[PDB]
Design a protein around this ligand. Structure first.
Ligand code: WRX
Length: 126
């Protein structure tokens, strides 16, 4: 029988994980609550930037939070992969390569073709 070892949970400080897809992430704060898993409707706060510091979007007050079905293709691939394994209360920084973001199409004329994206995401509910 396989057992989980919780390495990334125990030694998260200053740790940048690079996955087989090429996505990179770092837990800035480890969450205390439940774990995000595929199939769940999750709610989050977020800020997105280009590598050079230009902000392109944020979960501003309004009536947010932002919510989506994990693993269901409602968002960019780096988010469907990156949010899985976060715990409620956690803040996670995602560095997303263009293939896991908007690729060569870009978005709205604000995010250019072939852009790497940086996001800081806070998990509120699962
Ligand atoms: O595109 C989406 N899904 C389609 C899809 C599915 C599979 C693969 N590829 C695409 C969603 C839905 C959305 C579209 C447009 C919006 F304006 C707002 C939401 N978005 C996102 O996935 C990311 C990540 C989660 C927070 C929102 N953003 S985001 O901040 O980058 C958007 C943005 C981009 C450029 C801007 F100038 C401003 C906002």
């Amino acid at each position: 029988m396989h057992h989980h070892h919780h390495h990334e949970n125990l030694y998260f400080q200053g740790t940048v994980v690079t996955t087989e897809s090429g996505l990179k992430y770092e837990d800035l704060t480890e969450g205390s609550g439940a774990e995000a898993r595929a199939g769940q409707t999750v709610s989050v706060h977020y800020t997105g930037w280009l590598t050079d510091g230009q902000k392109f979007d944020s979960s501003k007050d309004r009536n947010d939070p932002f919510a989506f079905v994990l693993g269901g293709g409602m968002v960019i691939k780096g988010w469907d992969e990156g949010v899985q394994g976060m715990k409620v209360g956690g803040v996670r920084r995602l560095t997303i390569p263009p293939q896991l973001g908007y690729g060569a199409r870009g978005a709205g004329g604000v995010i250019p073709p072939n852009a790497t994206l940086v996001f800081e995401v806070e998990l509120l509910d699962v």
